[PDB]
Amino acid sequence: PSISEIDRSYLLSSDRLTEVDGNTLDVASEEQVAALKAQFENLKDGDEVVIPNGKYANLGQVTITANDVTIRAEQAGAAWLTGLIQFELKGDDITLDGLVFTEGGPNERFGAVRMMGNGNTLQNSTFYYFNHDYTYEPDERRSEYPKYLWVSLWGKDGKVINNRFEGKQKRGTLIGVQKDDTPDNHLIANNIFMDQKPNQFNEFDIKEAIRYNGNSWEAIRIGDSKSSQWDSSSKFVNNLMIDMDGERELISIKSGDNTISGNTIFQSAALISLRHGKGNTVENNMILGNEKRLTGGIRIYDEDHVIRNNYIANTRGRDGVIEGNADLRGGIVINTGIIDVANGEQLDQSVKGKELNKQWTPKNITIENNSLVDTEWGIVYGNQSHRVSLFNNAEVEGIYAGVDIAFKHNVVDNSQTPEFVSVRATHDFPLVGATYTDETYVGQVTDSELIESYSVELPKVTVENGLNAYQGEGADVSKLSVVTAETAGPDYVLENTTK
Numbered sequence: 214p215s216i217s218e219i220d221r222s223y224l225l226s227s228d229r230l231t232e233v234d235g236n237t238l239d240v241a242s243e244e245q246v247a248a249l250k251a252q253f254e255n256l257k258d259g260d261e262v263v264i265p266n267g268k269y270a271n272l273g274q275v276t277i278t279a280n281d282v283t284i285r286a287e288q289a290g291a292a293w294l295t296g297l298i299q300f301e302l303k304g305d306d307i308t309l310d311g312l313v314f315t316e317g318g319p320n321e322r323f324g325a326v327r328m329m330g331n332g333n334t335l336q337n338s339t340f341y342y343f344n345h346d347y348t349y350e351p352d353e354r355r356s357e358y359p360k361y362l363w364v365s366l367w368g369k370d371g372k373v374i375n376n377r378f379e380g381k382q383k384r385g386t387l388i389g390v391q392k393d394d395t396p397d398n399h400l401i402a403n404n405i406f407m408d409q410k411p412n413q414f415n416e417f418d419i420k421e422a423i424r425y426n427g428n429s430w431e432a433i434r435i436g437d438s439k440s441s442q443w444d445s446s447s448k449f450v451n452n453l454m455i456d457m458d459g460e461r462e463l464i465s466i467k468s469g470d471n472t473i474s475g476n477t478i479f480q481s482a483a484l485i486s487l488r489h490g491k492g493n494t495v496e497n498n499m500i501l502g503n504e505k506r507l508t509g510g511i512r513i514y515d516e517d518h519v520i521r522n523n524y525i526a527n528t529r530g531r532d533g534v535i536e537g538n539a540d541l542r543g544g545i546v547i548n549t550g551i552i553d554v555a556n557g558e559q560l561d562q563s564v565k566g567k568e569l570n571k572q573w574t575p576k577n578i579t580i581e582n583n584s585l586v587d588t589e590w591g592i593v594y595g596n597q598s599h600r601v602s603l604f605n606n607a608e609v610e611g612i613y614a615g616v617d618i619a620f621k622h623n624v625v626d627n628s629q630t631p632e633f634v635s636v637r638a639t640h641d642f643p644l645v646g647a648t649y650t651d652e653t654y655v656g657q658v659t660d661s662e663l664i665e666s667y668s669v670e671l672p673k674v675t676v677e678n679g680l681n682a683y684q685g686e687g688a689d690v691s692k693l694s695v696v697t698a699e700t701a702g703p704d705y706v707l708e709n710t711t712k
């Protein structure tokens with residue numbers, strides 16, 4: 214299967230996968246649910262709970278205080294936890310293994326799994342449309358729907374690995390990292406994410422509330438505005454993402470020193486977003502839009518980031534549907550911001566209008582050896598207007614272009630449809646101190662006079678296992694590979710599920 218022919222059956226297929234039939238599982242009685250629950254809360258260090266095959270409704274608030282415990286399905290995929298539940302993991306070195314969360318929802322808004330301890334792990338588990346049973350209504354203050362997460366990490370050295378997160382379709386980031394002032398070193402790797410999408414419950418019908426109701430549907434948010442000026446040093450690596458269309462941000466990085474690398478992002482109308490925080494690296498990802506509307510690569514605020522060796526193909530669309538959220542899309546988008554970083558200006562919680570949750574003009578960004586192939590909007594130099602907040606629609610006055618953006622060895626290849634815009638420069642917001650080394654742009658370049666030099670001649674193109682390899686330029690195909698269910702997600706698939 215070569216790039217343009219990839220589809221979800223290929224990505225999700227593997228011989229290694231067992232099939233678990235939900236219809237073969239018995240529904241635990243109220244008495245048995247209670248018995249399982251006491252087992253959880255009576256755990257001593259070093260013990261294990263093995264959950265017999267079955268469906269367990271409304272376990273509710275499950276607090277694990279023990280350390281070095283495993284809670285696992287007796288057969289992977291065959292312990293289905295339904296109705297309202299939250300595992301509150303307070304101990305260290307707690308592992309949840311082979312669980313299913315479906316036909317129900319989190320018992321508290323920070324998720325079915327609150328990883329509060331250190332060395333907590335969630336593995337081989339599946340969430341299937343876990344959007345139910347909790348109250349979900351526009352609030353009285355401002356008709357805002359509540360944000361419910363599925364997994365949150367509040368400790369150190371968490372792992373979320375080999376899980377399947379399918380069908381998140383009510384508001385709230387699917388995974389949230391809530392961190393303090395020191396590195397977290399979490400690993401979120403080898404997971405499958407599918408079919409996150411907004412406005413399935415008429416949320417957007419309240420027109421006045423759209424800018425915030427249409428926000429907070431990320432697949433993962435690492436950090437938050439208050440914690441954003443500290444390092445997380447977390448990794449979001451080797452994941453497979455299919456039809457993830459939650460909002461403009463697929464992955465919202467809001468802290469420093471993170472790695473967002475080697476993921477395959479297929480037909481997802483949502484971008485990797487370096488939203489707050491410094492020194493993040495986005496590398497070796499395969500972003501395959503497959504001509505789907507409003508697909509895109511990476512959008513960039515703040516400083517010192519490295520964007521290297523990504524392969525971004527067949528993406529489409531420039532303007533997101535909700536206005537006022539700077540939702541400008543393309544392969545790689547250098548956003549405008551609201552602070553004069555060329556003169557050393559910072560966001561600062563004390564400075565009114567320039568608080569840490571606002572928009573840090575990008576500076577000192579290295580963008581090197583990327584291949585953008587058949588991208589309708591390739592490298593887009595930002596021109597967004599910004600509003601005071603998600604709740605205040607006034608426009609900010611004073612908008613700045615990216616600074617010290619260093620472009621080297623990128624290939625933007627629109628030779629197939631050269632009317633597509635390979636590089637969108639703009640005299641409305643000229644980059645400051647931008648540099649160009651051995652760039653190759655084929656296709657429309659707007660306000661091209663702003664760019665010192667580039668080549669319009671593609672080097673020798675070979676197809677090396679389905680990818681375009683450009684001789685001596687662009688993404689090195691040796692560092693790239695498509696993630697499939699051969700390595701991503703759990704070791705089983707479920708049947709007879711209900712959305």
Ligand code: NA
Pocket residue numbers: 428429430431460462465
């Ligand atoms: Na967002």
